[PDB]
Amino acid sequence: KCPNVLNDPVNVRINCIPEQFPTEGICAQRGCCWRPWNDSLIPWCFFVDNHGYNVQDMTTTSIGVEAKLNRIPSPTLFGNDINSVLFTTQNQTPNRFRFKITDPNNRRYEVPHQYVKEFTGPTVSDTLYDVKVAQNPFSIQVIRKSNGKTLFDTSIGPLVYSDQYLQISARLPSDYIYGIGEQVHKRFRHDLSWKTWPIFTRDQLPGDNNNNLYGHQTFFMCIEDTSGKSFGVFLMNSNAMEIFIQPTPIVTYRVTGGILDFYILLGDTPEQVVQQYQQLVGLPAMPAYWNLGFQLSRWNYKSLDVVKEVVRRNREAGIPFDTQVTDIDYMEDKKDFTYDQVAFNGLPQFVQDLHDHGQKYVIILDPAISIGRRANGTTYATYERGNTQHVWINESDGSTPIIGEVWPGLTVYPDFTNPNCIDWWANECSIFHQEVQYDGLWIDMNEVSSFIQGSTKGCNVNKLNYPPFTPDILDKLMYSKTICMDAVQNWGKQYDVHSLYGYSMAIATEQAVQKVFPNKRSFILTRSTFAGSGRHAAHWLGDNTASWEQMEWSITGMLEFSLFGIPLVGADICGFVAETTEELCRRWMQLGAFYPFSRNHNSDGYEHQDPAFFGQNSLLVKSSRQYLTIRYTLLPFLYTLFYKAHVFGETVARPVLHEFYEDTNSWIEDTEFLWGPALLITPVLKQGADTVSAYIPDAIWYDYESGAKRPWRKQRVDMYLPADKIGLHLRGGYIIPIQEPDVTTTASRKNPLGLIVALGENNTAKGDFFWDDGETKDTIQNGNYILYTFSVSNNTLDIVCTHSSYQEGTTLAFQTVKILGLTDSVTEVRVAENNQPMNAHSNFTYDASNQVLLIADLKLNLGRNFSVQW
Ligand SMILES: *[C@@H]1O[C@H](CO)[C@@H](O[C@@H]2O[C@H](CO)[C@@H](O[C@@H]3O[C@H](CO[C@H]4O[C@H](CO)[C@@H](O)[C@H](O)[C@@H]4O)[C@@H](O)[C@H](O[C@H]4O[C@H](CO)[C@@H](O)[C@H](O)[C@@H]4O)[C@@H]3O)[C@H](O)[C@H]2NC(C)=O)[C@H](O)[C@H]1NC(C)=O
Ligand SMILES: *[C@@H]1O[C@H](CO)[C@@H](O[C@@H]2O[C@H](CO)[C@@H](O)[C@H](O)[C@H]2NC(C)=O)[C@H](O)[C@H]1NC(C)=O
């Protein structure tokens, strides 16, 4: 059966043959409607209303609604349907609604999240949403009651619930969708034109395609209208899946196992929706201050002598960099928890030299543990202890450990979901730290990557390894570049918990960090990610390529991870794969200075690409130094945004639409971004370019370098950015805290502080500032910090300390206040502490050309309150 109207509307057709080229026979065989088309974007075979479920009996509970569902008895799709299914609603908060669909007569796999708590009460009354549930056929419908706009409309297609194929579709109210990962999107706002996005954790070079990559994030967000009203949709399921987007727009989930567990999250602004999502899934970890310093790295330095030569040439070029990373070449025959005693002879002395300069040292750690013997024939202690404690992932029998292959040849895999394994791991890092004093860890190969397909002895041929429906994952082969789908772990079968491996290792390393650096924050950088891995680790965008495309795409990739609540994120500056250009790398170093996580990294064999390799008096070194210096100056501001992220769930690097949603031009913009609300970063992203077409939003902007008020507002301009400049603007209405830069955060942190006041329209400005020791894990939780509020109006600045419980912070002071965009010239400056009367201040400069005032040599000590008048 087909729609009564002959020339029906095509954008509402839900594809009935999603895995294969449509044929009339298979269409009929599935009981769907056959009606071919001029192109092959539009489905030729679609369920009109032929598949689905009906409600028979539904009741009310205190929390929401239970409903028993029965399969409308159409033919099967991929077999093993479940005829009798249970729908459950939970009105969790006034802002988030949750529904789930389960098998009453069997406990199906449910993601064993480590933060998402079970909900039972209390009952929330007066919610912002409204849930209508159609009866025949079943469909859910979520409505914003405020204005009656319907957000999530299941009525548009069937529910298909079979043992290995799950399908539900939803009509959305606008054409603006953001998120889903990890893939290369290229553009921040989604193309709606019939696109599949496969999600399944996987080791793969990011390129121009829809391949599933390192992380598994199902969250997407959507802006309803010009008032900023938005919502988000998160599906809690870790099986392989496709998310399909088509015009109207109707998004469709096709998933290979588990249950359907949806959360729908309302907000007043896009910023609020992202906050709501992090509330549910976990707020991001607060980083250590030194995490924000610049990092140098490469795969295969070959020897400690080359590492040394790189460090000293960069120190000499005056490049600010806090940390030195060291890839698998530091290890002995690429074995975890060892170091090459020959080519990396003298490592602990070198580590000592780093610490002597106030620098830090990060090592890579892979999950795979070698079955082999050490160099001089001795038993490999890590492997031996692993056996003793039975730490490994077993084959389908549940006894024999599975054998893959990674860097050191054949290997076994730790089951980081085992509480014994987390102990073993923590122990290994503790033992190793006594030999080599690392400062932080970088966990790689997280996806569970294997160089061989499946296992050392291949895969058993079954429904788990060769499922009835495979989504568009690379190679269309589940066990490709990973382990057998029937492998057993403590949380479950590989088929179910595959995408959770990287997640669990981040958790395991967060414990390991507490054993090694008691009560410190350290550093954990992870590759694979699941929902709310922000809570445990930092992420970088993987193995990119020295390529202008790839540099452009990193912005929209970084902004997506901001949505996913992993704020400490960056790409590999200058390009991992391939040799980089002087020109490309000069530009990427400018942009890279403004990634939340800022690190230059390179692949094996290609020429060096660290800044100082391009020449001590090179334009690249001059530029990089200048902008890394700007970065370091702004670190107090950045760090404060990270505090706000950790506490309220705000974004650090945010897209322009988050602040300027009243303008529909901001909705599509993704070639520039912001640090929080105040700083606008506009990079050069085309080869050879001298100029860039930039959309400058609806506010007052000041050039960061000069301080001059730009004559631009709510318009597109041709911004002139020569070989050494990158667009930096401060937004009027904001006060940002800065601190005199140095070449390490260690050194910079004891330097005098300062404020920048970008005045805005009504001659107002607001700002905040958070300061602690930047490393102790529980400072926020124990009230051991300083917190400030800034306020300007009537040509007078108020510095208000709202909390003060950190003694070593009292020694620092704001000693410099720069005020941009003055309406009238200045004669006298007066300064008062607390509420004492104001004395005159001599040291100041007024520049009538730029309307800039800079007040020098003050002594506004952290801890106390002050006023400054001009
Ligand atoms: C930053 O700088 C400005 C200085 O301009 C200060 O704001 C002014 O505040 C004063 C009082 O401190 C205001 O003066 C009074 O305004 C009344 C109008 O009140 C409403 O509207 C104003 C402006 O929109 C609001 O600010 C205010 O809250 C009210 O909502 C007048 O009616 C008053 O006049 C009285 O006397 C006249 C005769 O002289 C009679 O006609 C009336 O009956 C009445 O009795 C008075 O003028 C002033 O309006 C504000 N300025 C402006 C232009 O907005 C801020 O105080 C300062 N910031 C700080 C915190 O110091
Ligand atoms: C994989 O197999 C190992 C060994 O075959 C299992 O280890 C058992 O673990 C418990 C608790 O650590 C011990 O008391 C037993 O000594 C172990 N059994 C034996 C016979 O060695 C392990 O549980 C299996 N792992 C998973 C998750 O399947």
Ligand SMILES: *[C@@H]1O[C@H](CO)[C@@H](O)[C@H](O)[C@H]1NC(C)=O
């Ligand atoms: C496709 O078919 C429709 C309906 O018959 C028609 O209106 C449309 O123009 C066709 N497209 C092309 C490319 O001819």
